Chain length 388, copies 4
């Protein structure tokens, strides 16, 4: 076993093909299945795993009531092979109401945050043992990616924020070797608010596309140099912007440097990645709600400020059905590194009042250089057939 | 780990001996078990797995209502070790409402088709990662074997059809190396309609027996040359024909070249294989319905047009009990390659109206050169004891 | 991986110490657990497994009604690591209403009998594939040990009977190499009726203690020579006899050569083994019913006709609680081969009428050369708290 | 695979960071989960496992009634990877109503005690086989640590007691090599009553902190020399004492040599360990009840009689919530040996009368040399939402 370096070119991308779906809410109506949110996917060199933050209960269970809240002492990070839904034999790998995980080629790192809002603890678990921990630096909900971290040559990097959800906060990038924090760098650059980064290897460094919860409906970019620990940041150039909420497609804009100040407050975790001067990106179909999910390429949308020339659109979830968070993960092939993404399909409160719980299922697609058709792969549960 | 070449002679066959049964419908009345259809079996060099297309729900679950339909965005391919029934810890390996899987000696290939009827996508997943995809070529339900594919020296082959279920369609044979499509050949020869092929290694090539849904109650044969990609096809010679529906044994016929035009419309997935000039084949016992299941040898039934001289009959499922699809898989022994088959035992709608769901169990037999007795191994559930 | 030869001396035995218990009936009242009977234990060189014949259903399930019957097409052999109760993820390794399994050092052999009473089939599965099969030789319930077989230097041996349960039958000993039957020898010697043998390695051969269902309440012995295939048989010498039913301890007898003709009809599977001239044996405490379970040594009870001098008694299950079958298995230690046994704890019909099902749990003890105390480890379920 | 020697220095400790939590009582209200008590954690060189003594039943099950009792023939030791809650696929590794387990670098040892109070048996199982057993030496509930044993260079040591819970008893330290007892030493030194020791490697020997159930609310220490089998004992010096019950912090005392005779009767399993002259220790927050849980360092609390100068306090479970037993386990890092602890969170009878059962969940923390914040991680079930 050798460390991963991810030193292959990005695969050619013509769009995305279906990869996995867990159907977990449909299963929850006839089976004991965990209540979750904030899912993601990350793969070791052989095979992929699905992860999510449990709510310390199954769905058909009195403890599923009022699971809309994001942070409790009962949330744990669940980890199963991809496509195995979160049944009662699922391993809870750490105590977490925010997390990130990744494999360095040799073993798994988990970054797990729990405890009081004003004084949380992050644990750093590597190859099955606690190696490091830190306390909150700004006393305002220390929190992290909710998707995979990225490791090159044994140095894993993860983005964390502590501070306001609606104003200037303190973001830092940690560099971790076999579980030990070896350096911490503050965020630098023109991104003004950074949360929930979706990061990917872009050898020789790591590139992240994030959520600006304050003034941007355009997504921040954070670039991380793992050799010298330097950080740069800005915003995706595309005038078709990636956050929710956002303005409509004719009114929206980005010019790469600053938050657009267009319905910038609040947001949703999402992703994008560059392909030469173009950008591939996903977003909800609704501009206001976490409903629908579409991907497309914006021609020159990485390099040219405010480009809106899209092509190669695919519907992942039709506009009539619920989506949620989405994130990137990367998979090493024989000759190239592929990009894949998952979509959280949130069901229950507050939007759906027939039940008292909040949970989700997942759907997952991977880049292809081949061809594909059309469809829609929503959660699929009938809210009226669920236990309350 | 080396690629499989299957370069051993076929084992001697005197008939078939019991191998596996999962009892899944009986278990579903007191346990959380997936709703399935279109099951099959395929083995890696060590051990066998059962697969089937899930319906995105367990049976005792409101979402099992009206699971008679064949294609939805919730169907996934399930994969367990053979004899482990589809419980909630079962892995969903891909999104699929049609599939085929096989192991090349090194890793698993899955061919998984999903999305809109008029514009489906097939994903090609190998060693746990998406390697290729194609879109529908004829915009009319791209679909595949619903049983194992076959790999020689690292080149796996799979038969797919796109086009009418009741007239000329477009069948193609794909050749796939570590998940990458390297060649596609159109069907050639005198088979006029080919679906749901049951294929087996017949070194140096692959031989398939299929379903003609249009004009044949005799089964098509497709022979695939993996070295030069050439294809030949025709029909099993036996006058005791393998499809359902079919005429009775005195009225039925085949003369090897053409569909017989005898109750040829519709059909069921099945199998046969040659043993010198003779053929071993399975079929439903009923000529009209998917009820009962029998195997026998037809003397000269591979080589002599319209031969009806049977011997070595075995009842697998008595005439009074339900069957379904059946397919072949092959298993490498010390000195020879054995042939085995499974039978899908379908329960529920439309035929049984006491319940609202449709699902199945499996029973599996393998070739023997020894001796054996008699019996009947049906699904065994009492429809009146099931959840509706 | 090398073949086992079992060429170490028997361990010193002072009695038996607790090893495993599964509590499966207690668990069945609050969990989905298989209905079973005829359990046993067998270990590969690393670890032990529990096996039993399923009844194709869980206990809290309408299909558990009238599971008293011994042979149906739904019975399968279940196999889990020892101490893991038969939950819904349990593997059904073959179709069987009679079975025997054993590991030769390299892989598992399963001998699985199913089908019609008058014309059964035995399948021989080795390293996960069907290698051989035979049909019934006497058309009267071909049947086998219901406990582990034994392999020396790659040759596994198993005892099977076909014929009357209440008169002369046809017993044969099969010799099987990597799943292939290489020789079959008829029973020879003075045992007059032999069923359900509990066999153990006694290098250079195999020694079995069995059930005489016809005229003996003393247990038969069958000795098997694996080099030349010769067979000898007789009866355990001990005047404290091992079957149920039997006469009381003052009236019972054995003189080593013949069935005692004392309450000889019917019987229960059990075991014994020699220790020099002495014998270690288990039996039910009741002389009429499968209730209680005790072990003891009979001084000179292997060599001296009708010896009744017992010592080192241990109660395993108190007289007030139900037992069932019991069998031997052997485990290789650093310097010696240990002997262990399991006891089936049968609950439900016909004896207990509060429920409609019949099932069992297990308890398991292993030889020790150390010391121990006293106790009683019965099934423990309260029949009045069970689903009917 | 080599034997562990634990010959690295203790890691620096600044306090403890969250490691694992299983949420098992919350899950039990909507899932089939074992009833347990007396849990602990122990790790092989790769990964950690959670263990506990089952009560032979799940919680939503009539057999969970009156599970307050500590010893029955149905209790077994359960073992899962850490964070996997005790679902129905959990392995019961031995019959036990008292236990200890540990891995020597090569394989697992389990010490399992069961049977009659006045004449119990301890089984010693190593690498999956029974290797040794002993009977009760004093006929008064032979019993052991209920947490991990410790092995150096292949010699594992375990502390056991037999005798009164409220007066002089007979404690012995056993030394076990690949499952075989090679030496037994009696307790020696000034500890007057020793139960439920929490032991850790302190190369070249083993150090334990225990429970005095007779006259001490200060905890005993037992030091074990694995080379010459000699034993020394005394009491933790800290005037902030570790048992429950105890006097308040101003009235309590210890002077290192003798039991303090302060609310000394009864007790709870707990732990402490030295860090130079200082001691790190956990205790319940309540002085009378098993409620709350806190850890802190007592400056000079290892070396200076009656020191009460605490620093670095952390709440693990707030004062308003239930705790239970707690124990130490040790984990080998790249350069140092870390200390971790678990807390049993007991729910149900006798204290909570809304239900008829008694069970627990777990929470687990590991030493850190980093930083951390604050929180509280209690069991979290709502007693009014549980099955009775
Ligand atoms: C079977 O499945 C395939 C694959 O999914 C479908 O093909 C895709 O079809 C979509 C929708 O048409 C294509 O994406 C769209 O591309 C447009 C740009 O391409 C056109 O214009 C350029 C420039 O002149 C031409 O070079 C090019 O050849 C095309 O003529 C974008 O304008 C589209 O965005 C606009 O419309 C969408 C709604 O469709 C809005 O949401 C946007 O806001 C915007 O107004 C869009 O991106 C995609 O490129 C095709 N893929 C491929 C690989 O061909 C088939 O349509 C489908 N067939 C059926 C019947 O289901
Ligand atoms: C115990 O189990 C064994 C093994 O399963 C059973 O033996 C099989 O029995 C079946 C049924 O008889 C045999 O299959 C049949 O073979 C017939 C041809 O063989 C006979 O005729 C030839 C030519 O003259 C002779 O050489 C040969 O020795 C036989 O005399 C076919 O004609 C049969 O097909 C016809 O009948 C079946 C119904 O049985 C119809 O469905 C068909 O449409 C057709 O009319 C059939 O194929 C089989 O070969 C035997 N196997 C072996 C290996 O011997 C035992 O019968 C069974 N005993 C009991 C009591 O259960
Ligand atoms: C704690 O646990 C230990 C270990 O389990 C118990 O010791 C065993 O006790 C049993 C019962 O006494 C012993 O088994 C019996 O051995 C008798 C023969 O030994 C005695 O006689 C000989 C010959 O004179 C002496 O050499 C020897 O020292 C003994 O004095 C048999 O006669 C017994 O069988 C008879 O009684 C039983 C009921 O007990 C009947 O069911 C039989 O039909 C028959 O009448 C019996 O086999 C056993 O040997 C002891 N084991 C060991 C290793 O010592 C302790 O008794 C137990 N203490 C308590 C209080 O629970
Ligand atoms: C965020 O989280 C951090 C880490 O958990 C919290 O910091 C810990 O805070 C606790 C409570 O104050 C500290 O533990 C306490 O240490 C006291 C000794 O230290 C003080 O006094 C010495 C000697 O003069 C000074 O050198 C030192 O700098 C400190 O000023 C003990 O006296 C305390 O025990 C007493 O109070 C507790 C209740 O707190 C009682 O239960 C005891 O009986 C006793 O009366 C206690 O041990 C701990 O050391 C801090 N950790 C670290 C690493 O700094 C932050 O407080 C928290 N912030 C918030 C707002 O949540
Ligand atoms: C669902 O959960 C809510 C939130 O905890 C429960 O409401 C709390 O109930 C407690 C116990 O009576 C009250 O003290 C709190 O004031 C309630 N909080 C709020 C916001 O209402 C509620 O009881 C639970 N059950 C249902 C059926 O709603
Ligand atoms: C079983 O499933 C059917 C098919 O989806 C359900 O029937 C549909 O119900 C919706 C919601 O009311 C209607 O809009 C559709 O028109 C119905 N379709 C048909 C074909 O009837 C049915 O409600 C489900 N439940 C039961 C008990 O039958
Ligand atoms: C329990 O199983 C028995 C045995 O199969 C069932 O009884 C059979 O019921 C069928 C269907 O009505 C009858 O044709 C058979 O004659 C019955 N056999 C006997 C021996 O009675 C019985 O119905 C099942 N259910 C219960 C509640 O007893
Ligand atoms: C809960 O368990 C208790 C303890 O076993 C049960 O009470 C026993 O019930 C038996 C059977 O009637 C009586 O002979 C015993 O005398 C009872 N013992 C005691 C201490 O009361 C009780 O029945 C069980 N069920 C419930 C609902 O309490
Ligand atoms: C609390 C926490 O750690 N993360 C939560 C974040 C933050 O509230 C925002 O990023 C603002 O900081 O967003 C969610 O609320 C959301 O939008 O669905 C869910 C997630 O659990
Ligand atoms: C829809 C699909 O992909 N395959 C389906 C096929 C096709 O309808 C036919 O082969 C005609 O094309 O047959 C089934 O309907 C059937 O007969 O039981 C089930 C299967 O799911
Ligand atoms: C039918 C079969 O294969 N074996 C059965 C045997 C035989 O009936 C006897 O050995 C007589 O032949 O005994 C049982 O009935 C029994 O006594 O509990 C159970 C077992 O399933
Ligand atoms: C019975 C047994 O083996 N151990 C039990 C011990 C002993 O009773 C005491 O240590 C006194 O000896 O403590 C418990 O009761 C307790 O306090 O919660 C539980 C545990 O099961
Ligand atoms: O942004 C609006 C717009 O999307 C794209 C364009 O090519 C238009 O045809 C469509 O109306
Ligand atoms: O096809 C009909 C036929 O099957 C075969 C024959 O050998 C007949 O005896 C039987 O009636
Ligand atoms: O067989 C009867 C008998 O068992 C033994 C003897 O040593 C007696 O004491 C007892 O009564
Ligand atoms: O033991 C009582 C005490 O705890 C510590 C001290 O430093 C005090 O301030 C507190 O009141
Ligand atoms: Ca925003
Ligand atoms: Ca047809
Ligand atoms: Ca008898
Ligand atoms: Ca005390």
């Amino acid at each position: 076993a050798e460390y991963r370096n991810w030193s292959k070119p990005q695969c050619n991308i013509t769009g995305f093909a279906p990869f996995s779906k867990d159907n977990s809410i449909r299963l929850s109506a006839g089976g004991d299945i965990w209540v979750t949110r904030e899912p993601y996917v990350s793969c070791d060199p052989d095979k992929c795993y699905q992860f999510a933050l449990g709510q310390g209960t199954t769905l058909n269970n009195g403890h599923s009531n009022d699971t809309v809240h994001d942070r409790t002492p009962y949330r744990t990070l669940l980890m199963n092979e991809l496509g195995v839904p979160f049944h009662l034999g699922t391993k809870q790998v750490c105590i977490a109401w925010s997390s990130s995980s990744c494999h360095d080629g040799k073993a798994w790192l988990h970054v797990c945050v729990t405890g009081d809002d004003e004084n949380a603890t992050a644990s750093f678990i590597y190859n099955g043992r606690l190696v490091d921990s830190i306390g909150s630096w700004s006393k305002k909900i220390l929190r992290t990616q909710e998707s995979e971290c990225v490791c090159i040559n044994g140095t894993c990097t993860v983005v964390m924020t502590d501070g306001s959800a609606s104003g200037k906060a303190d973001t830092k990038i940690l560099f971790i070797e076999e579980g030990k924090i070896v350096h911490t760098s503050p965020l630098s650059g023109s991104a003004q608010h950074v949360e929930e980064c979706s990061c990917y290897p872009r050898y020789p460094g790591v590139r992240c596309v994030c959520r600006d919860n304050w003034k941007g409906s355009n997504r921040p970019i954070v670039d991380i140099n793992v050799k010298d620990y330097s950080i740069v940041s800005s915003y995706v150039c595309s005038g078709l912007v990636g956050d929710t909420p956002r303005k409509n497609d004719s009114s929206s804009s980005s010019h790469c440097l600053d938050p657009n100040n267009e319905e910038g407050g609040h947001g949703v975790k999402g992703w994008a990645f560059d392909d030469g001067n173009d950008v591939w990106m996903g977003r909800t179909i609704s501009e206001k709600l976490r409903s629908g999910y579409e991907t497309f390429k914006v021609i020159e949308g990485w390099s040219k400020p405010n480009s809106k020339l899209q092509i190669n659109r695919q519907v992942i979830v039709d506009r009539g059905n619920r989506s949620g968070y989405s994130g990137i993960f990367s998979v090493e092939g024989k000759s190239c590194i592929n990009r894949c993404f998952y979509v959280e399909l949130i069901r229950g409160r507050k939007q759906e009042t027939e039940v008292l719980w909040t949970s989700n299922s997942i759907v997952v697609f991977c880049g292809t250089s081949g061809t594909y058709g059309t469809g829609s792969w929503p959660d699929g549960a009938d809210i009226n057939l669920m236990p309350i």
